[PDB]
Write a protein that binds this ligand. Structure first.
Ligand SMILES: [Mg+2]
Ligand SMILES: [Mg+2]
Ligand SMILES: [Mg+2]
Ligand SMILES: [Mg+2]
Ligand SMILES: [Mg+2]
Ligand SMILES: [Mg+2]
Ligand SMILES: [Mg+2]
Ligand SMILES: [Mg+2]
Ligand SMILES: [Mg+2]
Lengths: 138, 176, 199, 190
RNA sequence: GAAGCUACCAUCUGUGGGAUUAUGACUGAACGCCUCUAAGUCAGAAUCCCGCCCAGGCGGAACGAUACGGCAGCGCCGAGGAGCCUCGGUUGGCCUCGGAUAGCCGGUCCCCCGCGGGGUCCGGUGCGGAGAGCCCUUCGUCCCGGGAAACGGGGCGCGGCCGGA
RNA sequence: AUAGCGACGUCGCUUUUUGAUCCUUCGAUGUCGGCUCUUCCUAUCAUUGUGAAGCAGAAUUCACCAAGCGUUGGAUUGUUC
RNA sequence: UAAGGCGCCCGAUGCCGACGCUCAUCAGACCCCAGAAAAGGUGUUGGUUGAUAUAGACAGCAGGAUGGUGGCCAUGGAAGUCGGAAUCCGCUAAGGAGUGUGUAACAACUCACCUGCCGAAUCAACUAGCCCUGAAAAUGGAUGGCGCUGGAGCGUCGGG
RNA sequence: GGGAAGGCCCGGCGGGGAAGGUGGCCCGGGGGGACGCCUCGCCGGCGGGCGCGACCCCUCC
């Protein structure tokens, strides 16, 4: 079954191309594999864009199928897409990936040191729990 | 013509040189879809030589300039009247496309002609390009996009960038 | 350091080209479960192609003529050989770095097998097209070990299911322990979260 | 041209229930259960509407070549529903000129033996498909009844026992002998 | 005329399956009906492939015995002892479900069958139970303190029990 | 008209007939037949499985998958024929 | 850089290349060049022209499908159905001196045409792309090979 | 083309138009939420049901 459709007013996340990594709102469907979109608030000038480079999110905001950028921005601000996107888990994973990429060598060493303890404690406690479960089974 | 890249629309006006017979020959204007102004002028001379008794040696390009799209943010339906050469005989046709720019629609027309009839740019003679209302549209491939509540999914997304993780332990997912 | 590939779902030539390039580049490659490989085009077409290959033999002495191997592993081996300069020492040394197998032998069943998305059927073929199974093609061309390998694969699958269940149980213990000890491993977690290894 | 959407809906009666796991459908009713998968069609099946009222088939972005599969899926599902609620009864008759055709049923309707087909010393032995029951019709001189739930199985058995009796090396326009499907109805009528 | 060779000039023996071609069909749309075809399904042969049969690979397997009694040569072990010559490449490991893709993955008692398999429900889903990942992480030693551990670490240090074709 | 044929036309295929040419060979590639022996082709005479007849049966036509297996013994002639 | 190329052989697309077309039980794949035509396809994709359809079509399922008259010349027999011209009228919602099957002739069936149910698009005739039929030779065999079908094929194109 | 669009200020404001018709209205159904018909749950209570007839009584999507 399909849950994410392409209609007027859906928010999609651009994966690659000029505006890579930005949200955008679908205004119209030009053709089978091209849509007229704009990110009035995410800094993306109104333009055409292929379907091959956007990934659909589960955010819908209402405006007519050819409304101008004024009304598109009005609907975007009214629905407050930015904070909800920042709060969703998708953006959290993206932001964490960006953090890991940005990490320099000193924080790499610090992360190694912290992970050593984290794994050691977890492994010891897991051994304790496994022994306890075995004793309970016996 | 070599339909290189995306075409551009040029307004080209030309006239015969003044002669003792007539001081001021009438100026003739034409719309040329071309990669650049040089080939635009060449096509203008070709068409005007077919139409009138005019040649480049006995004429002059009074003006030649690109005409920009009037509304490049409104998706429009374009009807194109076209004249092309097959392997046996020549035919007139009318085709509709859906795009934001007249030049983009004409480029789509050239690519579609090459794909469907193996006709080449030196065979296609473009005749008329008009904005056509959705009620006046008559090709179903364009008409099916005329509704307020358009809605369709992307069913089978094929994995691109197949080579960046050239060896990956997942079998990729095609349902998003 | 050896690249272990799984054949199931991969296309013959598409996988063979990548394997040949990797082998020529010096890497040791072992491809496994060759009878799961599939070829585009319908089964009758592919069977006809293999029969046409079978028909090619030296008229005066077939014993010296082309050798038509019937096992799927050897079929894949030969189509890989077709993409290497096997008449030279470099090509022969490369070809010696490749190992093919039907099913999954004991040296490799207890290992993680890699996957090549650039040669996968689900990626390279639209669903409306027809494909053929190399295992069935070989079996009804004259491969004699389709059933034995099937039973052995069934045994391997039923053992791997037990191993995977044990892995699931052990990890679940791991997660329960993690949420149990979050109290005293919290100060070790915010650093990973700030550097984006745990969010 | 690829159509944006092609859909068609099927209404199911109250006495029968339908459960689908992806593209395989299971139909359960008074006469039994029928299962059929459709993984070779690649369209969308939805059991929309509480009270299991309807089953909808969707196809997005399909040319005319695969647009035909929607109605064939719907027809297959309707046939499964009909065979589950009512069942399928294929009635066939044996036509002969001189030699009577002696048909005897064994394995409680699973095997059909045909003898004396044009003075034949050979004995035709045809096995029914699993779930198809053969019988000799009462209140009729010579007629066979095939009972089943799967229309494909019943009709395949009928075709098998029809093609088992064909004249060889003779004018089939004159030697009109054999068993032919007289009509195809249901076990019980509405 | 022995023996031996030897003759349709004597006598004996000569095989079974599978996918399918042509063709005939089932269900069934496209195209309200129809249709062997488009998706799916069936029967199908001196053909094809294999079996039976002949050979047996710079292809493997199991098993037996493995060099005196004056010398001796051998096999296994002593985490057995120093070395000498020669051939090189390498410069951290990942020890594993099956598989789908017009769908998947993980928990669950709230139920049903034989710990496993189903049902409901709850979570994730551009895969944070991720290979775009995980694990180990090495300058060394000496004092005192805090955090984790007291169940842990190390032992051809041990004797057994299972685990594998 | 089209079971089976097919006029007046017109489009092809083959190199098992003959031509046309003269590229190789004249410090030589032994130049007709028959005998013997193997393999290959199908444009299928028979046999296996089919479809169509102006196919009642018998016989016989036309067509399809198809070269697996067979295709003889003699008079006359150096003959191929 | 030219010409030519960039899946592997084999240096170069390991571009998140663009738009389409095409399934081949003989696919196709680059000047010279190394193999094919006339004629066809309800395979599929475009295009041209003309029709009829809420005064309710196209299917499909059902009812009618009449008198003069078995029209005239005819043949042994021709009632419509082998033959020669014409083809009228009243009844009609409609019926042709007849579209076909059938008998020696009838008979009978059936069609043109009109009605009932169903309620929105449906018919043709051409034309051009790819694919398919046409398409048969001898040692086993050659888009250079492997192989390729979200193309590594065909057409138009872009960066590198 | 002394850039073509575009942005902001409801710019104001002049009139006009249909449609890929927003509300509104009419018809139809998929519904539900008040759950108004049974069944359990604790004669009064709330929660359990993953309850069960509704029907223009509305009432929302
Ligand atoms: Mg006969
Ligand atoms: Mg068989
Ligand atoms: Mg068939
Ligand atoms: Mg079969
Ligand atoms: Mg070294
Ligand atoms: Mg010689
Ligand atoms: Mg000599
Ligand atoms: Mg032949
Ligand atoms: Mg090259």
């Amino acid at each position: 079954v399909f849950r994410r459709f392409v209609e007027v007013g859906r928010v999609a996340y651009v994966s690659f191309g000029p505006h890579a990594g930005k949200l955008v709102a679908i205004v119209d469907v030009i053709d089978q594999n091209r849509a007229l979109v704009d990110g009035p608030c995410t800094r993306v000038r109104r333009q055409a864009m292929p379907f091959k480079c956007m990934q659909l999110t589960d955010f819908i905001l209402k405006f007519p199928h050819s409304a101008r950028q004024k009304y598109v921005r009005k609907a975007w601000e009214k629905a407050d897409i930015n904070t909800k996107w920042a709060a969703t888990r998708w953006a959290k994973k993206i932001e964490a990936r960006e953090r890991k990429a940005k990490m320099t060598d000193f924080d790499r060493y610090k992360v190694m040191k912290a992970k050593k303890m984290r794994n050691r404690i977890i492994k010891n406690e897991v051994k304790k729990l496994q022994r306890a479960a075995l004793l309970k089974a016996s | 013509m070599k339909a290189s890249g995306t075409l551009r629309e040029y307004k080209v006006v030309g006239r015969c040189l003044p002669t003792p017979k007539c001081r001021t020959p009438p100026l003739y204007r034409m719309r040329i879809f071309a990669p650049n102004h040089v080939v635009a002028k060449s096509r203008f001379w070709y068409f005007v030589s077919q139409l009138k008794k005019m040649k480049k040696s006995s004429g002059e390009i009074v003006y030649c300039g690109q005409v920009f799209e009037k509304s490049p943010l409104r998706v429009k339906n374009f009807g194109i009247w076209l004249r092309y050469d097959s392997r046996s005989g020549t035919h007139n046709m009318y085709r509709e496309y859906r795009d934001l720019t007249t030049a983009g629609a004409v480029t789509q027309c050239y690519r579609d002609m090459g794909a469907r009839h193996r006709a080449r740019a030196h065979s296609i003679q473009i005749m008329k390009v008009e904005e056509i209302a959705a009620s006046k549209c008559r090709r179903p491939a364009v008409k099916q996009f005329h509704d307020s509540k358009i809605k369709f999914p992307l069913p089978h997304r094929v994995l691109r960038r197949q080579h960046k993780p050239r060896f990956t332990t997942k079998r990729p997912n095609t349902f998003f | 350091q050896v690249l272990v590939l799984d054949g199931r779902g991969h296309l013959l030539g598409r996988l063979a080209a990548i394997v040949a390039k990797q082998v020529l580049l010096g890497r040791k490659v072992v491809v496994v479960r060759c009878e799961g490989i599939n070829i585009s085009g319908n089964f009758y077409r592919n069977k006809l192609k293999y029969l046409a290959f079978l028909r090619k033999r030296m008229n005066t002495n077939p014993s010296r003529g082309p050798y038509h191997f019937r096992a799927p592993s050897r079929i894949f081996w030969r189509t890989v050989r077709g993409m290497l300069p096997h008449k030279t020492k470099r090509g022969q040394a490369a070809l010696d770095r490749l190992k093919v197998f039907d099913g999954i032998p004991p040296p490799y069943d207890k290992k993680k097998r890699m996957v090549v998305p650039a040669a996968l059927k689900v990626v390279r073929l639209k669903p409306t097209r027809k494909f053929a199974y190399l295992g069935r093609l070989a079996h009804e061309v004259g491969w004699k070990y389709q059933a034995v390998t099937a039973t052995l694969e069934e045994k391997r699958k039923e053992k791997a299911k037990i191993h995977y269940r044990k892995k699931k149980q052990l990890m679940r213990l791991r997660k329960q322990a993690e949420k149990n000890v979050e109290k005293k491993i919290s100060k070790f977690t915010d650093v990973l979260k700030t550097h984006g290894l745990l969010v | 041209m690829k159509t944006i959407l092609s859909n068609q809906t099927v209404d199911i009666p109250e006495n029968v229930d339908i459960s689908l796991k992806g593209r395989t459908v299971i139909v359960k009713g008074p006469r039994g259960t029928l299962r059929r998968d459709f993984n070779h069609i690649n369209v969308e099946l939805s059991l929309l509407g509480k009270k299991k009222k309807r089953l909808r088939v969707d196809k997005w972005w399909g040319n005319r070549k695969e647009l035909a599969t929607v109605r064939t899926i719907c027809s297959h599902v309707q046939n499964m529903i009909k065979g589950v609620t009512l069942g399928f009864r294929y009635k066939m008759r044996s036509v002969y000129a001189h030699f009577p055709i002696n048909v005897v049923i064994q394995e409680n309707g699973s095997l059909v033996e045909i003898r004396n087909f044009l003075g034949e010393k050979y004995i035709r032995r045809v096995r029914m498909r699993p779930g198809v029951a053969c019988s000799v019709s009462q209140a009729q001189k010579d007629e066979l009844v095939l009972e089943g739930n799967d229309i494909e199985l019943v009709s395949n058995s009928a075709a098998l026992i029809q093609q088992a009796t064909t004249v060889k090396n003779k004018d089939i326009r004159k030697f009109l002998d054999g068993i032919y499907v007289s009509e195809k109805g249901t076990v019980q009528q509405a």
